[PDB]
A paper describes a structure:
RPA is thus a critical component for replication, repair, and recombination pathways. The largest subunit, Rfa1, possesses four OB domains: DNA-binding domain-A (DBD-A), B (DBD-B), C (DBD-C), and F (DBD-F), which are connected by flexible linkers.
We produced recombinant full-length S. cerevisiae RPA heterotrimer complexes of Rfa1, Rfa2, and Rfa3 in bacteria (denoted as ScRPA). Recombinant ScRPA was purified to homogeneity as judged by SDS–PAGE and gel filtration analysis coupled with in-line multi-angle laser light scattering (SEC-MALS), suggesting intact complexes. Although full-length proteins were used to form the ScRPA-ssDNA complexes,, the winged-helix domain, as well as some of the N-terminus of Rfa2 were invisible. The reconstruction measures ~81 Å × ~58 Å × ~36 Å in dimensions and a model of the ScRPA Tri-C (based on homology models) can be fitted into the EM density map. Subsequently, the model was flexibly fitted using molecular dynamics flexible fitting (MDFF)32,33 and further refined using jelly-body refinement routines in Refmac534 within CCPEM35, and real-space refinement procedures in Phenix36. There are a number of yeast-specific insertions compared to the human or fungal structures, the most obvious being for DBD-D and DBD-E. The presence of ssDNA in the reconstruction is further supported by the observation that in the absence of ssDNA, RPA molecules do not assemble into dimers and trimers and the majority of the Tri-C particles were isolated from dimers and trimers. We were able to reconstruct the relatively small Tri-C stably bound to a 20-nt segment of the ssDNA to surprisingly high resolution given its low molecular mass (~55 kDa). Our studies suggest that DBD-A/DBD-B may be more dynamic than previously thought, whereas the trimerization core is more stable on ssDNA.
Author numbering:
A (entry chain C): 442 to 619
B (entry chain A): 1 to 122
DNA sequence: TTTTTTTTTTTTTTTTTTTT
């Protein structure tokens, strides 16, 4: 009793639609193509459930607008996204702190301190983690900033290492085809 | 090699005469190293298809190719066209999946069937 | 047996190995 059947990204835009306004994400099995080098982790204050992005006053220490505090450790949160490819479409997936932290197994502060570090192991981790296969739960929403609007996707979960269940499931689908 | 080497069922020895093919099945230990027992069931039990086991004669050929118990191996072999002899053991590839996990042979069987009905794709 | 609070709306991945 596991999740097996699913659809693709090409079938995600229009399949016998609609489905007018209603849906909640869905499961996707897709390989990872490339990891963007820009917009990895944005800095913020260290606390639980921080919705504010700290800025720099003419001080030199990070300052939060809503909650006044002195930030000793500028705790970073993952804004990093990834470029993925599937059986049909080539899409882009936006990962959160837990999703991107679970992807490479490295936190945001250690990743930012790893990039600014003298050794080149940052590019070694970036190139070693890229080009893999992964499973996500992706949802689609349409947001508009000013003059530009398009549908974007996010990652609600990560799953991998499943092999036997997919092979036996496809084998059963082959046996039930007759 | 560079030629076509599809995966065929060990019971197809009567269909094709002396080809070069690869087999993925279960390896059993004989009383001697000159014989081999290949356990290859098919899908469901009571559906009408049962376990297909084929015995081969290893003789002295491929001494270092001896198979480990419970391990999997890709069998590169050529059938003998004379008689009273199984598939000649030539090459073997180490085959295992993961730790604390196994693999069902059904997905393999459906493999070996499809490549029989569709020679275009392997 | 699955229900948001951490940005901005682009995004480039391998760019050099090869006959007459």
């Amino acid at each position: 009793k596991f999740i097996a059947q699913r659809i693709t990204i090409a079938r995600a835009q229009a399949e016998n639609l609609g489905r007018s306004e209603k849906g909640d994400f869905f499961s996707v099995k897709a390989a990872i193509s490339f990891l963007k080098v820009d917009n990895f982790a944005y800095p913020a204050c260290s606390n639980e459930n921080c919705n504010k992005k700290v800025l720099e006053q003419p001080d030199g220490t990070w300052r939060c607008e809503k909650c006044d505090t002195n930030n000793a450790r500028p705790n970073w949160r993952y804004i990093l996204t990834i470029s993925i490819i599937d059986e049909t479409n080539q899409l882009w997936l936006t990962l959160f702190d837990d999703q991107a932290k679970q992807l490479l197994g490295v936190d945001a502060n250690t990743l930012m301190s790893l990039k600014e570090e003298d050794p080149n192991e940052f590019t070694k981790i970036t190139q070693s983690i890229q080009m893999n296969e992964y499973d996500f739960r992706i949802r689609a929403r349409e947001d508009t900033y000013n003059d530009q609007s398009r549908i974007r996707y996010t990652v609600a979960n990560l799953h991998s290492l499943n092999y036997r269940a997919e092979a036996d499931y496809l084998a059963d689908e082959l046996s039930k085809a007759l | 090699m560079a030629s076509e080497t599809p995966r065929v069922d060990p019971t197809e020895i009567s269909n094709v005469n002396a080809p070069v093919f690869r087999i993925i099945a279960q390896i059993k230990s004989q009383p001697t190293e000159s014989q081999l027992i290949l356990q290859s069931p098919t899908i469901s039990s009571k559906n009408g298809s049962e376990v297909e086991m084929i015995t081969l004669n290893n003789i002295r050929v491929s001494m270092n190719k001896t198979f480990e118990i419970d391990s999997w191996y890709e069998f590169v072999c050529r059938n003998n066209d004379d008689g009273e002899l199984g598939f000649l053991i030539l090459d073997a590839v180490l085959c295992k999946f993961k730790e604390n996990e196994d693999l069902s042979l059904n997905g393999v069987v459906a493999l070996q069937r499809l490549c029989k009905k569709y020679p275009e794709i392997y």
